[PDB]
Design a protein around this ligand. Structure first.
Ligand SMILES: O=c1[nH]cnc2n[nH]c(-c3ccccc3)c12
Length: 338
């Protein structure tokens, strides 16, 4: 019986006279992902190998149950989600066999040298992601992904704009509270930072952040810790509304209630732009040729196009999760008309 939790995997070895192991795609907390040729189906697959560890095996059983639930739906909307082909036990590890995809949206940004992709490509990513979220919001699914980030959104083909969401290892269904901290820090919703109840809206918050990063090349809110994260949100969006902070268990981590009942930033031990003064209008360069002026003298980047982009993002970054734009209504936004 092996001492480590990981599976030993030798490039070039062949599993069950079927999977020819090519190379390591990625490592993580969960275990590893390998590129393999399925000699039976004559196609590439990505094999996700789960650590022989109770917590990761539990997360992977949740991922299997949610992916298999999604598979039973007829709608074409399900093809924005990575397809789990099959799962088995091999050498005492749970192995998930997925369709092989191309590189993630972070890799794509790195290929631009973090200058961002065009508004037209951003629009195509946005429409596919809102469609994916509409699918997850189907009542019989009600799935919160809980870890949307550029690294979890993969191109199907390196030449094309088609994308798929991966990694439902941290996911839950509406009304569940399983893990103490959720969402990747840069993409973490205000309701999660505040310890308030969360629903499918946290995913629309993450999507708002992601789409700005895809067009500018840089994370909108790049916090080094939760206090820094909330302070960077506040630079762009202002102090959250009183009706939220009055109900937030962790309001006093970030904010203080003054004698007149109004909320301010908490005094530091002893730096940020004043609240609401880092305008998304200027981050996007609506009137000034896009990010760093680099999109003036290109087409598909008009002031009119930027205003529609800005208006949709600010609906996704609503502090109030009951009024934040829902996928069903995001898809009807004029940003998608053209
Ligand atoms: O990481 C991955 N790289 C390339 N193709 C992939 N297909 N599915 C995955 C994957 C699926 C679930 C969780 C993590 C990665 C891939």
């Amino acid at each position: 019986v092996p001492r480590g939790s990981h599976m030993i995997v030798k490039n070039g070895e062949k599993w069950m006279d079927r999977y020819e192991i090519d190379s390591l795609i990625g490592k993580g907390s969960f275990g590893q992902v390998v590129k393999a040729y399925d000699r039976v189906e004559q196609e590439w697959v990505a094999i996700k190998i789960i650590k022989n560890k109770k917590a990761f095996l539990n997360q992977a059983q949740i991922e299997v149950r949610l992916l298999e639930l999604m598979n039973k739906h007829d709608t074409e909307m399900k093809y924005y989600i990575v397809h789990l082909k099959r799962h088995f036990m091999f050498r005492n590890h749970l192995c998930l066999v997925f369709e092989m995809l191309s590189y993630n949206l972070y890799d794509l940004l790195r290929n631009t040298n973090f200058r961002g992709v065009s508004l037209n490509l951003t629009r195509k990513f946005a429409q596919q992601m809102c469609t994916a979220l509409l699918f997850l919001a189907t009542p019989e699914l009600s799935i919160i992904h809980c870890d949307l980030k550029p690294e979890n959104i993969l191109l199907c083909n390196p030449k094309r704009s088609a994308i798929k969401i991966v990694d439902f290892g941290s996911s839950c269904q509406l009304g569940q509270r399983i893990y103490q901290y959720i969402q990747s820090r840069f993409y973490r919703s205000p309701e999660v930072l505040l310890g308030m109840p969360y629903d499918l809206a946290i995913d629309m918050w993450s999507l708002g952040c992601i789409l700005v990063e895809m067009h500018t090349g840089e994370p909108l809110f790049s916090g080094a810790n939760e206090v820094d994260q909330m302070n960077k949100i506040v630079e762009v969006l202002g102090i959250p509304p009183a009706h939220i902070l009055d109900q937030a268990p962790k309001a006093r981590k970030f904010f203080e209630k003054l004698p007149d009942g109004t909320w301010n930033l908490k005094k530091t031990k002893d730096e940020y732009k004043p609240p609401g003064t880092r305008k998304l209008h200027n981050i996007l360069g609506v009137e000034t040729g896009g990010p760093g002026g680099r999109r003036a003298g290109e087409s598909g980047h008009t002031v009119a196009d930027y205003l529609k982009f800005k208006d949709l993002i600010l609906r996704m970054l609503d502090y109030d999760p009951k009024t934040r734009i829902q996928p069903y209504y995001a898809l009807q936004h004029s940003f998608f008309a053209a």
